[PDB]
Amino acid sequence: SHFFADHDAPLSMLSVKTEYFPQLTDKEQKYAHFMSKASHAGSRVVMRQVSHESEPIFDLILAIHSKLNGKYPEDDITQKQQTGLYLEYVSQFLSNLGNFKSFGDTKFIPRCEVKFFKQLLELAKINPSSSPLTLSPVDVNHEFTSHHLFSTINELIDIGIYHVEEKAALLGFPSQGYTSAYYLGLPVTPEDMALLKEQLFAELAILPENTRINKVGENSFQIWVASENVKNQITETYPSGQITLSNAVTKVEFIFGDHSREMRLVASYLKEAQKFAANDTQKAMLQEYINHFVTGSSQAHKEAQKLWVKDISPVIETNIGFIETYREPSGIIGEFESLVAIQNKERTAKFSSLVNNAEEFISLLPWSKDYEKPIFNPPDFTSLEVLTFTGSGIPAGINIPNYDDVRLKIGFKNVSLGNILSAAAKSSSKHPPSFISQEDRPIFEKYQSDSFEVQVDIHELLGHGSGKLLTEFTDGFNFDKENPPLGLDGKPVSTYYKVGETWGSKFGQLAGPFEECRAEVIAMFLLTNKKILDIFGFHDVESQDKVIYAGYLQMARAGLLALEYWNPKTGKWGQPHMQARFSIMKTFMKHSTDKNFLKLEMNSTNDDFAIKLDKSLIKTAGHECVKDYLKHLHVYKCSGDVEQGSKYFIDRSTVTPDLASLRDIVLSKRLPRRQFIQSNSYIDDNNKVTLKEYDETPQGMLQSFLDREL
Ligand SMILES: [Mg+2]
Ligand SMILES: [Mg+2]
Ligand SMILES: [Zn+2]
């Protein structure tokens, strides 16, 4: 593996300005605005938590750009190449808010020559011997930053930016030769963090998520608390000054005011958004967040979360703070992150319409009422559009809070991030989607997104929502035990779920991919339904057939891309959704009534191919092989036929020699980790919230952050 930044990384502008944002009321826009400002105010916080050089590098990047007036070297074509490489590093750095990638926790360095990097200083007239401290905003409290670890800017470039050591290039315990920005001073050991967890935090009932550890001695620690306050204003919970643990040796002192500058900014913006909250619960929630970032009380954040869980299906969903605790070695301290996601209000309405008509579509599904619930119970499913996500990496969904006591007692939120999931399937880059023929590029590029959304909604509502397991209870069955439902062969099934037995227990690990497949096939099945399309806003036959075509084409492609997550050595799948999609693509190709429904045209060098899917066969062969696959999956699952069901699905998901031969090709067409650019909001002369977007380029990413500094 290499330690270089990505080249030709795909950049996605998280656009919500044209379609989604305009749907929000004025109040909702203002709320979204200030929560976004609060989110971005924590950018530097994340950096300080990724690596010690991260913030300094950020400052240097800003300094260079400023002193060069945004004009980078472009004389010789070599200078152009070196500039591009430099900007690609900057872009990836900004995408991860630091120089250790969130996906892998490994340090990455620029591809441009170090000599060139230092030439940027020459051009910008930045004295390489000066201290990085001179590059920081004057109101950043350097007592809690890492600039001092680098005597000169030259050292920052050499050691911070470029230097690589196998161990040091990985997040972990500094005592073991690794890197961690959660720890400062002397090398922090696992024993240290084990002791602090039990004999300090647990002992004093103090949640550790918003802290950093400064080891000032072999047995002396400082606990830096993230807060605007520079003093302890919560002595009822936090000890004042130095204390000694139970071992009468270890000394610990809580020091407040870490990230004070940013905490103050975050709190000020939360206060603004509070004026525009949608209900009293959101207002109270914000107050606790404010108490949390101002005072440093970690309990206040938990109090915010308890209120948050009680805020049902808001139009503007948010969550902020030191949330996930996996990047810190001992796994108890959280990395800052902040989310602002908005409803697609039109989509929410369409989904409601789908629910209101659910029973009708359920009946249309290819099985007897014997394998269906008498009354439809709509599953819980939330899809939102990311407007802002400040953090080391933007997830495809969120499942929080992480406080086990709150999750159990009050509940938790599970939210899917639409425009993030959509990007993974869209496969947007600096030119055509892999394996899509030129002939299909137009329609695919135009309808892929729409078909994807339609399929997701059906998948989640009617897909997972449908079905009844033939089950035994302590005193009776939910089916006619004497004359059980008929199987696919027309004979009464002899299988069922005995008392205590569940889908998961009976089908074991196969249950995951199997059910995801069933849900996916249900979506494909109903994709061609006239009223379904009407509900989703496709009323004319021409656009309908295009959505359908794009849906089948996208599924075929997805099943082939899935080969990446199949291990040719062990034959085991790495992701349930991938195995399911593959089985469906394989169904099109090998189990249709017409062999020419799905074909793969290899190029002359057998290192690339084009998907040939016959649109005119979708109505017949296409629909029938999907309906066929669905009937088997559903009856097998519901009748508890683990024996037939397993063999059936395992076979359909088995990578045949011909398809296995394509894996290398699939791997070669893999796009690098996607980098997301976030909009910037502001209030105009007319007191109107306005969104500013940016080009999907390294310069665009850079600009999006420049516009956030001042
Ligand atoms: Mg039916
Ligand atoms: Mg049978
Ligand atoms: Zn699913």
PDB file of C-alpha atoms in Angstrom, residues 252 581 688:
ATOM      1  CA  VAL A 252      -5.044  14.316  37.492  1.00  0.00           C
ATOM      2  CA  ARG A 581     -27.356  -7.233  -6.111  1.00  0.00           C
ATOM      3  CA  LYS A 688     -32.953  35.764   2.718  1.00  0.00           C
TER       4      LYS A 688
END
